Amino acid sequence: DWTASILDQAQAPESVADFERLLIGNPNSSVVWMNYMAFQLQLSEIEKARELAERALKTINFREEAEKLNIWIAMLNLENTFGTEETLEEVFSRACQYMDSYTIHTKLLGIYEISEKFDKAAELFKATAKKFGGEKVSIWVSWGDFLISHNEEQEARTILGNALKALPKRNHIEVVRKFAQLEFAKGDPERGRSLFEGLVADAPKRIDLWNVYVDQEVKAKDKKKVEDLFERIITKKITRKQAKFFFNKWLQFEESEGDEKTIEYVKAKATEYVAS
Numbered sequence: 001d002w003t004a005s006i007l008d009q010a011q012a013p014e015s016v017a018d019f020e021r022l023l024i025g026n027p028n029s030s031v032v033w034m035n036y037m038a039f040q041l042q043l044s045e046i047e048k049a050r051e052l053a054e055r056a057l058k059t060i061n062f063r064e065e066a067e068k069l070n071i072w073i074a075m076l077n078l079e080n081t082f083g084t085e086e087t088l089e090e091v092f093s094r095a096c097q098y099m100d101s102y103t104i105h106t107k108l109l110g111i112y113e114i115s116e117k118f119d120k121a122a123e124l125f126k127a128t129a130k131k132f133g134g135e136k137v138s139i140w141v142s143w144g145d146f147l148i149s150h151n152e153e154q155e156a157r158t159i160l161g162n163a164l165k166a167l168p169k170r171n172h173i174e175v176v177r178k179f180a181q182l183e184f185a186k187g188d189p190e191r192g193r194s195l196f197e198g199l200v201a202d203a204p205k206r207i208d209l210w211n212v213y214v215d216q217e218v219k220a221k222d223k224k225k226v227e228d229l230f231e232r233i234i235t236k237k238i239t240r241k242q243a244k245f246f247f248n249k250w251l252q253f254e255e256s257e258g259d260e261k262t263i264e265y266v267k268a269k270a271t272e273y274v275a276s
Contacts, residue, residue, distance in 0.1 A: 002038035003031060006074045009110050010066065013039070027059050030070035037074060046082045053078065057098075065099075072099055073107050080111050102132045102139075109142070118150065129159075133166045137175050140167070144179055148187045156187070173199055177212060184216045192216065193225075207242055214246075218253050226253060227262070234273065243273060 013019045019036040026032050033056035037049035056071045072095045079088035096104045105128045112121035125143045133139055140163035144156040160179050164172055176195050183192030196213040203209065210233050217226045230250050234243065247270045254263045 002041060002077075003034040003074075006034060006070060006077060007031070009073055009107055010070050023059075028061050028064050028067055030056065030060065030067040030074075033060070033071060034074050037078070041078075041082070046078065049078060050075075069099060069103070072104065076104075076108055076111055080108075080115055102128070102136060105132070106139075106142070113146070121146065129162070129166070133163065135167075137163070137167065137171050137178070140175055141178050141182065144182055145186065148182060153183075153187055153191065156182075157191070173203070173206075173209070177209070181212075181216060184220060189216075189220055205237060207236070207238065210236065214249070218249070223257060223259075234269070244270075247273075 013022060013035065019032070019039065022029075022032050023036070033052060037052040037056075040046075040049040040052065053071060053075045057068065060067050060071065062068075072091070075091045076088065076095070079091050092104065092108060105124065109121055109124055109128070112118070112124065125139070125146060129139050129143060140159065143159050147153070147156040147159065156179070160176070163175055167175065176199055180192040180195040180199075183189060183195065196209070196216075199209055200206075200213065210229075214226065214229050214233070217229055230246065233246055238246075247266055250266045251263065254260075254266060257263075
């Protein structure tokens with residue numbers, strides 16, 4: 001189902017008459033327009049499907065942004081699959097003219113990834129970070145994801161250095177965090193640990209970050225690494241609500257583990273803390 005794919009990136013009529021019939025009552029439904037062009041695509045007139053797209057862009061009410069976004073995305077797919085690099089560059093271009101450019105960029109990236117033109121994706125990743133990287137964090141994250149996914153993990157860290165030069169300082173912690181989470185999930189968790197260690201070396205006091213850190217570890221489930229981390233946390237500068245909070249986590253963890261010496265060891269350590 002062609003249309004459903006587009007609906008995912010966006011984040012029964014058997015005939016022309018059937019379709020045109022729906023469109024009378026439902027002119028604003030990108031879904032109808034896309035099924036309609038998909039219907040044609042399967043019969044291999046892509047020029048007919050190209051026409052529908054333009055008709056949809058014109059008929060769908062200008063106030064319905066998400067509906068029109070869908071049409072543009074369906075066209076990007078059209079041109080990327082059955083078109084040529086010049087048709088695509090045309091749609092691309094109009095699109096960023098008519099819709100939010102960064103959005104359109106992220107979408108074409110997604111498309112290249114699915115079509116497996118990785119050379120084309122890489123290049124646009126660099127082009128998009130040139131353009132929007134001064135201000136959008138997600139491009140930097142999305143690129144490091146790409147790079148990790150394609151097994152250049154050092155390149156990921158190179159472009160992370162790039163993102164920190166590009167980006168204001170209030171975005172620095174964030175994007176590093178998010179890279180750390182990346183490393184844990186698709187990357188080398190050691191590299192993520194290192195990144196976290198940095199964040200928490202600079203800001204010993206942002207306790208939300210120690211949390212994020214341990215969660216990643218409580219999720220990698222290396223018993224030691226988690227426990228040594230809990231060890232360190234309690235020795236930090238902590239509000240009683242924070243303190244009590246970490247122990248339940250610690251307890252909950254050892255539960256999912258089932259080592260009941262430690263399960264006890266936590267309840268003891270808690271009470272020792274509760275004294276002051």
